[PDB]
Amino acid sequence: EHTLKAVRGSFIDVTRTIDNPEEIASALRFIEDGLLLIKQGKVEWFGEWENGKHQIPDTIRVRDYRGKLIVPGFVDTHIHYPQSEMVGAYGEQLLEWLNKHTFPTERRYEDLEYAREMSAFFIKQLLRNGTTTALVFGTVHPQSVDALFEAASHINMRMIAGKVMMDRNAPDYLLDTAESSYHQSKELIERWHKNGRLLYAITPRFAPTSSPEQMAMAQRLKEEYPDTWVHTHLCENKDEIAWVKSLYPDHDGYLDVYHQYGLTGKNCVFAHCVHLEEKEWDRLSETKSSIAFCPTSNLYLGSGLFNLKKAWQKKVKVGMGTDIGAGTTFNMLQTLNEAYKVLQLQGYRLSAYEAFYLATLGGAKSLGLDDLIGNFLPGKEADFVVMEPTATPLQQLRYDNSVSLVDKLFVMMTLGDDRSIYRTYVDGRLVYERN
């Protein structure tokens, strides 16, 4: 409420949002001997230790993380809460993956005791990997979303989540109705939206599993609550696209289904977007919609390769998602490593600065939270990660041989996993410690 916290160490952040990756080098900030002052869970002062140490009264001990690297909390823009335990070994693609693996897994989260246990486990996985803000697919059952929101509220986490809307083309145990989906999402909105740092997303799974009536209910919810988020899947798989064209033949493609139902615009986030024509690229760019780039699940399911270069050209906001469930890791560093491989296959060179930006401030911007999180600017919420770049013998050996900042970022990205995460602070408090 009024007590100060002081953290010294080496910091990396990006001081402003940009519009081309070539700009990132001029917005990146690295302070080897830096100092972060925290009050009321927000950044109070940040800069060089020699310019700010006078502000620390003799009554306070500084959290001394010298030798570590302190970065803003990672931002995961697409992840499924009720899918941590999922294993899909039989090399299925998207639709068979949904019927064989996704739905039976999410069925176990109808139990509220199981949902309660797994919500704590899910949040701990996030913190364990340095993710402090995520845009989260929930369940179809509203009480499991209640459990997830309660677990996140325990630590005053900034999280966007919502109930999945799906009333057709899925097993009976995982279906709602248009009317029930409207009313349950409305109850969750009134209970959790802008409850502390929590935020609600109107979350239809995708167009195949929602009737026109349910799509209208999602449109109605967005009109009644214009400051909520929208979150859905878009053009992940070609068979999915053909299925959509078969189910909505009178619309001008896949994205046009969401557009006609008023589900495009700012803070509307579309996961995957692997197979877009120009109609849809330009629509996303004019409506200022966001994309959740999920390279790992794209690879595992053989969906394809996301065109990050065309996203930069079209001025579309892109953030990174793990798509846990189909993806296998909660870790943002490994996600960026897989993105690097995906882009190398397209001849696109992903710089370390660009990867770091997409992991932090770029993801926050894609979620419309860049005024709240993403760097160490005074006034930002104090979500950050203390990383140990020497946490593994090979990682330490390659870090001991890196002198430049790009070398350090590249080593962190290519060799990093959960062991690289030494401590995680959320709302200015230590909420995870690797020990």
Q: Which residues are annotated as a binding site for substrate?
A: 80-83, 205-206, 233-236, 323
Residue 323 Cβ, how far from Zn ion at the closest point, in Å? 4
Is 344 a residue that touches a copy of itself (CB under 8 A)? yes
CB of 410 to Zn ion, least distance (A): 20
Among 397, 429, 430, 433, binds a copy of itself (CB under 8 A): 397
Q: Taking the CA atoms of the chain, what radius of gyration do you get in angstroms?
A: 21
Q: Residues touching a copy of itself: how many (CB under 8 A)?
A: 48
Residue 136 or residue 415: which is nearer to Zn ion going by CB? 136
Is residue 350 a contact point for a copy of itself (CB under 8 A)? yes
In our burial notation (b when 16+ CB lie closer than 10 A, e otherwise), range 371-387 reads: ebbbbbbeebbbbbbbb
Question: How far is the C-alpha of 273 from the C-alpha of 284, rounded, in Å?
Answer: 10
The nearest distance, CB 78 to a copy of itself, in angstroms, is 18
Indicate the residue among 323 and 383 with the shorter CB distance to Zn ion: 323
Place of tokens 């977007």: 273
Q: How far is the CB of 433 from a copy of itself (least distance, A)?
A: 15
Give CA angle at 335 (36, 206), nearest 5°: 110
| Interacting residue with a copy of itself among 42, 62, 84, 241 (CB under 8 A) | 84
The listed partner (Zn ion, a copy of itself, none) that binds 323, CB under 5 to 8 Å by sort, is Zn ion
Contact window for a copy of itself (CB under 8 A) among 139-147, 236-244, 325-333, 369-377: 325-333
Q: Determine the residue type at 393.
A: P
The alpha-helical segments, DSSP class H, found in 287-326 are: 295-300, 308-313
Q: Are 376 and 337 in contact (CB under 8 A)?
A: no
How, if at all, do strands 164-165 and 198-204 pair?
A: parallel
Residue 347 interacting partner from Zn ion, a copy of itself, none (CB closer than 5 to 8 Å by kind): a copy of itself
Verify binding: residue 339, a copy of itself, rule CB under 8 A: no
373 binds a copy of itself (CB under 8 A): no
Count CB-CB contacts under 10 A for residue 104: 13
Indicate the annotated binding residues.
78, 80-83, 205-206, 233-236, 323
**323 lines the binding site for Zn ion (CB under 5 A):** yes
What is the DSSP code (8-state) at residue 98?
I
**Which residue of 260, 300, 372, 434 would you call a contact of a copy of itself, by CB under 8 A?**
300
CA distance 407 to 389: 12
Tokens representing 24? 């990132």
User: What is the spatial distance between Cα 410 and Cα 134, in angstroms, rounded to a whole number?
Assistant: 23
Q: What are the structure tokens assigned to 158, written together?
A: 């900034």
| Candidate residues 389, 398, 422, 426; the one interacting with a copy of itself per rule CB under 8 A | 398
Contacting residue, 143, 285, 351, 390, with a copy of itself by CB under 8 A = 351
Stretch binding Zn ion (CB under 5 A), from 52-60, 220-228, 261-269, 315-323: 315-323
341 touching a copy of itself, by CB under 8 A? yes
Residue 323: left if φ>0, alpha if ψ -120 to 50, beta else—which one? Answer: left
284 phi, psi to nearest 5 deg: -60, -35
Sign of CA dihedral 99, 79, 172, 87: positive
- Please give the residue ranges that form the binding site for a copy of itself (CB under 8 A): 84-91, 121, 124-125, 128, 299-302, 328-330, 337-338, 340-341, 344-345, 347, 349-352, 392-394, 397-398, 400-402, 404, 406-407, 409-411, 414-415, 417-418
